[PDB]
């Protein structure tokens, strides 16, 4: 897992994200949808958004971006003991939204990229290493919960 020092790096960086959740969330979704168009197909909600420029202008996309990062923040703040937060998310994402684990890898990469872009000093090698481990743990535990369902 992660050391307390590593968790501390993660949560300090996350505090910077919390300053502008909608801005960060919108950019994560844009990178996801543009980088991997197959992911946009899982969202009937955003079916009319056909370009990066349209995505950037959509208040609704920004709103959902905020929802995603708020939920992720809740999980991160529980450090290594996050089963209660992961369970319902695994349930909805497996059974209703039908989200493969690969797509969780894609959104993890998008998150890292956005953090690099918005926080070039603060999000250095050590912070990036720790955040990568934290997102890997999230993915592994989502995947494990998928199997229990
Ligand atoms: C960081 C990882 C993610 C988090 C924290 C997250 C969080 C959430 C939350 C809290 C909701 C609303 C409640 C629910 O239905 O579960 C939601 C809905 C949804 N999620 Fe995710 N999600 C993540 C990744 C993904 C990915 C990668 C996809 C698809 C590629 C996806 C597809 C969807 C869809 C289609 C909905 C319903 C949206 C709507 O029609 O309003 N999720 N997600």
Curated annotation (Swiss-Prot):
The modification Phosphothreonine is found at residue 67. Its main location: cytoplasm. Nitrite binds at residue 64. O2 binds at residue 64. It catalyses: Fe(III)-heme b-[protein] + nitric oxide + H2O = Fe(II)-heme b-[protein] + nitrite + 2 H(+); H2O2 + AH2 = A + 2 H2O. The keyword RNA-binding does not apply. GO terms for cellular component: cytosol; extracellular exosome; sarcoplasm. It is found in: Cytoplasm, Sarcoplasm. SUPFAM superfamilies: Globin-like (SSF46458). Heme b binds at residue 93. It is linked to Myopathy, sarcoplasmic body: An autosomal dominant, slowly progressive muscle disorder manifesting in adulthood with proximal and axial weakness that progresses to involve distal muscles. Patients may lose ambulation after a long disease course, and some individuals develop respiratory or cardiac symptoms. Muscle pathology features include sarcoplasmic bodies in skeletal and cardiac muscles. Belongs to the globin family. Monomeric. This is Myoglobin. It comes from Homo sapiens (Human). The lineage of its organism: Eukaryota, Metazoa, Chordata, Craniata, Vertebrata.
């Amino acid at each position: 897992g992660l050391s307390d020092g590593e968790w501390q790096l993660v949560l300090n960086v996350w505090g910077k994200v919390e300053a502008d959740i909608p801005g960060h969330g919108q950019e994560v979704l844009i990178r996801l949808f543009k980088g991997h168009p197959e992911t946009l197909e899982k969202f009937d909600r955003f079916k009319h958004l056909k370009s990066e420029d349209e995505m950037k202008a959509s208040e609704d996309l920004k709103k959902h971006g905020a929802t995603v990062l708020t939920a992720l923040g809740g999980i991160l703040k529980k450090k290594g003991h996050h089963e209660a937060e992961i369970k319902p998310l695994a349930q909805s994402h497996a059974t209703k939204h039908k989200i493969p684990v690969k797509y969780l890898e894609f959104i993890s990469e998008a998150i890292i990229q956005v953090l690099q872009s918005k926080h070039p000093g603060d999000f250095g090698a050590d912070a990036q290493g720790a955040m990568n481990k934290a997102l890997e743990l999230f993915r592994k535990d989502m995947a494990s919960n998928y199997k229990e369902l």
